[PDB]
Design a protein around this ligand. Structure first.
Ligand SMILES: *[C@@H]1O[C@H](CO)[C@@H](O[C@@H]2O[C@H](CO)[C@@H](O)[C@H](O)[C@H]2NC(C)=O)[C@H](O)[C@H]1NC(C)=O
Ligand SMILES: *[C@@H]1O[C@H](CO)[C@@H](O[C@@H]2O[C@H](CO)[C@@H](O)[C@H](O)[C@H]2NC(C)=O)[C@H](O)[C@H]1NC(C)=O
Ligand SMILES: *[C@@H]1O[C@H](CO)[C@@H](O)[C@H](O)[C@H]1NC(C)=O
Lengths: 96, 91
Protein backbone atom coordinates (compact mmCIF):
# COMPACT_ATOMS: atom_id res chain seq x y z
CA UNK A 1 0.00 0.00 0.00
CA UNK A 2 2.70 2.49 1.02
CA UNK A 3 5.23 3.12 -1.73
CA UNK A 4 8.89 3.34 -0.80
CA UNK A 5 8.83 7.14 -1.19
CA UNK A 6 6.34 7.61 1.68
CA UNK A 7 8.24 5.66 4.34
CA UNK A 8 11.17 7.98 3.62
CA UNK A 9 8.89 10.95 4.29
CA UNK A 10 7.74 9.39 7.56
CA UNK A 11 11.30 8.81 8.76
CA UNK A 12 12.32 12.32 7.67
CA UNK A 13 9.44 13.81 9.66
CA UNK A 14 10.41 11.76 12.73
CA UNK A 15 14.06 12.83 12.43
CA UNK A 16 13.20 16.52 12.03
CA UNK A 17 10.83 16.40 14.99
CA UNK A 18 13.30 14.62 17.25
CA UNK A 19 16.22 16.94 16.39
CA UNK A 20 14.29 20.24 16.46
CA UNK A 21 11.90 19.71 19.39
CA UNK A 22 13.31 16.97 21.64
CA UNK A 23 10.83 14.47 23.05
CA UNK A 24 8.05 17.04 23.53
CA UNK A 25 6.59 16.35 20.08
CA UNK A 26 5.45 12.86 21.10
CA UNK A 27 3.22 14.03 23.97
CA UNK A 28 1.41 17.07 22.58
CA UNK A 29 2.40 20.20 20.67
CA UNK A 30 5.98 20.54 19.49
CA UNK A 31 8.04 23.01 21.53
CA UNK A 32 11.40 24.06 20.12
CA UNK A 33 14.61 24.02 22.17
CA UNK A 34 18.31 24.38 21.24
CA UNK A 35 20.15 21.10 20.71
CA UNK A 36 23.06 21.79 23.13
CA UNK A 37 20.39 22.57 25.74
CA UNK A 38 18.61 19.28 24.95
CA UNK A 39 21.74 17.16 25.33
CA UNK A 40 22.11 18.74 28.77
CA UNK A 41 18.61 17.51 29.64
CA UNK A 42 19.55 14.01 28.48
CA UNK A 43 22.79 14.10 30.49
CA UNK A 44 20.82 15.14 33.57
CA UNK A 45 18.43 12.28 32.85
CA UNK A 46 21.13 9.60 32.83
CA UNK A 47 22.56 10.89 36.13
CA UNK A 48 25.34 13.35 35.19
CA UNK A 49 25.01 17.04 36.01
CA UNK A 50 24.52 19.37 33.06
CA UNK A 51 27.64 21.45 33.74
CA UNK A 52 29.65 18.45 32.53
CA UNK A 53 28.28 18.82 28.99
CA UNK A 54 28.83 22.54 28.39
CA UNK A 55 32.42 22.67 29.67
CA UNK A 56 33.07 19.65 27.41
CA UNK A 57 30.69 20.55 24.58
CA UNK A 58 33.03 20.81 21.59
CA UNK A 59 34.90 17.57 22.33
CA UNK A 60 31.63 15.67 22.71
CA UNK A 61 30.42 16.94 19.34
CA UNK A 62 33.55 15.63 17.64
CA UNK A 63 33.11 12.20 19.20
CA UNK A 64 29.53 11.98 17.96
CA UNK A 65 30.52 12.88 14.41
CA UNK A 66 33.31 10.31 14.34
CA UNK A 67 30.97 7.55 15.49
CA UNK A 68 28.53 8.26 12.67
CA UNK A 69 31.30 8.04 10.10
CA UNK A 70 32.34 4.61 11.30
CA UNK A 71 28.83 3.28 10.67
CA UNK A 72 29.07 4.31 7.02
CA UNK A 73 32.12 2.05 6.72
CA UNK A 74 30.87 -0.74 9.00
CA UNK A 75 27.82 -1.66 6.92
CA UNK A 76 29.74 -1.99 3.63
CA UNK A 77 32.20 -4.44 5.19
CA UNK A 78 31.22 -7.69 6.93
CA UNK A 79 28.58 -8.72 4.36
CA UNK A 80 26.39 -10.46 6.94
CA UNK A 81 24.82 -7.66 9.02
CA UNK A 82 21.73 -7.29 6.80
CA UNK A 83 21.01 -11.03 6.89
CA UNK A 84 17.89 -10.57 9.01
CA UNK A 85 16.42 -8.53 6.16
CA UNK A 86 17.87 -10.73 3.41
CA UNK A 87 16.66 -14.12 4.66
CA UNK A 88 13.00 -13.02 4.58
CA UNK A 89 13.20 -12.35 0.84
CA UNK A 90 14.96 -15.65 0.14
CA UNK A 91 12.49 -17.58 2.27
CA UNK A 92 9.48 -16.38 0.31
CA UNK A 93 11.07 -17.18 -3.04
CA UNK A 94 12.02 -20.66 -1.86
CA UNK A 95 8.43 -21.43 -0.91
CA UNK A 96 7.06 -20.39 -4.28
CA UNK B 1 -16.31 -6.76 28.28
CA UNK B 2 -17.51 -9.95 26.56
CA UNK B 3 -14.31 -11.89 25.84
CA UNK B 4 -12.09 -8.93 26.62
CA UNK B 5 -10.99 -5.99 28.72
CA UNK B 6 -11.16 -2.21 28.27
CA UNK B 7 -8.78 0.37 29.75
CA UNK B 8 -9.56 4.05 30.34
CA UNK B 9 -6.25 5.94 30.47
CA UNK B 10 -6.14 9.36 32.17
CA UNK B 11 -3.21 11.49 30.96
CA UNK B 12 -1.92 15.07 31.02
CA UNK B 13 -1.21 17.22 27.94
CA UNK B 14 0.25 20.75 27.62
CA UNK B 15 -2.18 23.18 26.01
CA UNK B 16 -0.99 26.79 25.53
CA UNK B 17 2.65 27.64 24.86
CA UNK B 18 4.58 30.91 24.96
CA UNK B 19 8.09 31.34 23.68
CA UNK B 20 10.90 33.45 25.11
CA UNK B 21 14.66 34.05 25.04
CA UNK B 22 16.86 31.45 26.73
CA UNK B 23 20.47 31.13 27.90
CA UNK B 24 22.54 28.23 29.25
CA UNK B 25 24.10 29.94 32.28
CA UNK B 26 24.56 33.24 34.12
CA UNK B 27 27.91 34.87 34.93
CA UNK B 28 27.78 37.05 38.05
CA UNK B 29 31.26 37.70 39.51
CA UNK B 30 33.43 35.55 37.30
CA UNK B 31 31.37 32.50 38.30
CA UNK B 32 28.85 30.63 36.15
CA UNK B 33 25.52 29.80 37.82
CA UNK B 34 23.59 26.81 36.45
CA UNK B 35 19.94 26.01 37.27
CA UNK B 36 19.12 23.22 39.69
CA UNK B 37 15.76 21.92 38.41
CA UNK B 38 14.73 24.58 35.91
CA UNK B 39 15.64 26.67 32.87
CA UNK B 40 16.48 30.34 32.35
CA UNK B 41 13.94 32.45 30.45
CA UNK B 42 13.67 36.09 29.45
CA UNK B 43 10.47 38.01 28.64
CA UNK B 44 12.36 40.87 26.98
CA UNK B 45 14.06 42.75 29.80
CA UNK B 46 14.36 40.53 32.90
CA UNK B 47 15.67 37.02 33.53
CA UNK B 48 13.84 34.33 35.51
CA UNK B 49 14.17 30.61 36.24
CA UNK B 50 11.17 28.43 35.39
CA UNK B 51 10.22 24.79 35.74
CA UNK B 52 10.33 23.05 32.38
CA UNK B 53 6.65 22.05 32.12
CA UNK B 54 4.72 25.10 33.37
CA UNK B 55 5.44 28.82 33.09
CA UNK B 56 5.96 29.93 36.71
CA UNK B 57 8.74 32.53 36.77
CA UNK B 58 10.82 33.18 39.87
CA UNK B 59 13.67 35.42 40.97
CA UNK B 60 17.16 33.99 40.50
CA UNK B 61 18.85 33.41 43.86
CA UNK B 62 21.90 31.64 45.25
CA UNK B 63 19.64 28.97 46.76
CA UNK B 64 18.09 28.35 43.33
CA UNK B 65 21.27 27.97 41.23
CA UNK B 66 24.61 26.21 41.75
CA UNK B 67 28.03 27.61 40.86
CA UNK B 68 30.63 25.73 38.82
CA UNK B 69 33.89 27.23 37.61
CA UNK B 70 34.25 30.53 35.79
CA UNK B 71 32.34 31.98 32.83
CA UNK B 72 35.12 31.84 30.21
CA UNK B 73 34.41 28.28 29.01
CA UNK B 74 30.65 28.15 28.36
CA UNK B 75 29.43 29.36 24.97
CA UNK B 76 26.16 31.21 25.54
CA UNK B 77 27.06 32.82 28.85
CA UNK B 78 25.14 36.01 29.73
CA UNK B 79 25.32 38.78 32.30
CA UNK B 80 22.93 39.23 35.24
CA UNK B 81 22.63 39.52 39.04
CA UNK B 82 21.78 37.08 41.82
CA UNK B 83 19.90 38.12 44.95
CA UNK B 84 21.72 36.09 47.65
CA UNK B 85 18.88 36.38 50.18
CA UNK B 86 20.84 37.20 53.33
CA UNK B 87 21.46 40.98 53.11
CA UNK B 88 18.19 42.13 54.81
CA UNK B 89 18.81 39.80 57.76
CA UNK B 90 22.44 40.94 57.93
CA UNK B 91 21.33 44.55 58.48
C1 LIG C 1 9.16 41.35 32.06
O1 LIG C 1 9.05 41.02 33.45
C2 LIG C 1 9.41 42.09 34.33
C3 LIG C 1 9.33 41.55 35.74
O2 LIG C 1 8.01 41.61 36.25
C4 LIG C 1 8.50 43.29 34.10
O3 LIG C 1 8.93 44.38 34.92
C5 LIG C 1 7.86 44.83 35.78
O4 LIG C 1 6.77 45.40 35.03
C6 LIG C 1 5.67 45.83 35.85
C7 LIG C 1 4.59 46.31 34.91
O5 LIG C 1 4.89 47.59 34.38
C8 LIG C 1 6.14 46.91 36.83
O6 LIG C 1 5.06 47.27 37.68
C9 LIG C 1 7.31 46.40 37.66
O7 LIG C 1 7.82 47.45 38.47
C10 LIG C 1 8.42 45.88 36.75
N1 LIG C 1 9.52 45.34 37.53
C11 LIG C 1 10.63 46.03 37.80
C12 LIG C 1 11.66 45.32 38.63
O8 LIG C 1 10.80 47.17 37.39
C13 LIG C 1 8.53 43.71 32.64
O9 LIG C 1 7.58 44.73 32.40
C14 LIG C 1 8.23 42.51 31.73
N2 LIG C 1 8.35 42.90 30.33
C15 LIG C 1 7.29 43.18 29.56
C16 LIG C 1 7.60 43.56 28.14
O10 LIG C 1 6.14 43.13 29.99
C1 LIG D 1 29.66 40.50 31.16
O1 LIG D 1 30.62 41.07 32.06
C2 LIG D 1 31.98 40.91 31.64
C3 LIG D 1 32.85 41.44 32.77
O2 LIG D 1 32.56 42.79 33.06
C4 LIG D 1 32.18 41.65 30.32
O3 LIG D 1 33.52 41.51 29.88
C5 LIG D 1 34.14 42.82 29.79
O4 LIG D 1 33.50 43.67 28.83
C6 LIG D 1 34.09 44.98 28.76
C7 LIG D 1 33.23 45.80 27.81
O5 LIG D 1 32.25 46.54 28.51
C8 LIG D 1 35.54 44.87 28.30
O6 LIG D 1 36.13 46.17 28.28
C9 LIG D 1 36.33 43.97 29.23
O7 LIG D 1 37.64 43.75 28.71
C10 LIG D 1 35.62 42.62 29.40
N1 LIG D 1 36.36 41.72 30.29
C11 LIG D 1 36.61 41.85 31.61
C12 LIG D 1 36.09 43.07 32.32
O8 LIG D 1 37.25 40.99 32.22
C13 LIG D 1 31.23 41.08 29.29
O9 LIG D 1 31.35 41.79 28.06
C14 LIG D 1 29.79 41.15 29.78
N2 LIG D 1 28.89 40.54 28.81
C15 LIG D 1 28.03 41.24 28.06
C16 LIG D 1 28.05 42.73 28.25
O10 LIG D 1 27.29 40.70 27.25
C1 LIG E 1 7.92 31.96 18.70
O1 LIG E 1 8.66 33.09 18.20
C2 LIG E 1 8.63 33.11 16.76
C3 LIG E 1 9.54 34.22 16.29
O2 LIG E 1 9.16 34.64 14.98
C4 LIG E 1 7.19 33.27 16.25
O3 LIG E 1 7.18 33.20 14.83
C5 LIG E 1 6.29 32.18 16.82
O4 LIG E 1 4.94 32.42 16.48
C6 LIG E 1 6.44 32.12 18.33
N1 LIG E 1 5.62 31.05 18.89
C7 LIG E 1 4.42 31.26 19.44
C8 LIG E 1 3.72 30.05 19.97
O5 LIG E 1 3.92 32.39 19.50
Amino acid sequence: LLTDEMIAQYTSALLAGTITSGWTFGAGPALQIPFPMQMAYRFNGIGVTQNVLYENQKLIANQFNSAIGKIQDSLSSTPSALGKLQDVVNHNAQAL
Amino acid sequence: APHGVVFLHVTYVPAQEKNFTTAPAICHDGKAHFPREGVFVSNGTHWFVTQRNFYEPQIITTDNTFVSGNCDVVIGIVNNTVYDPLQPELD
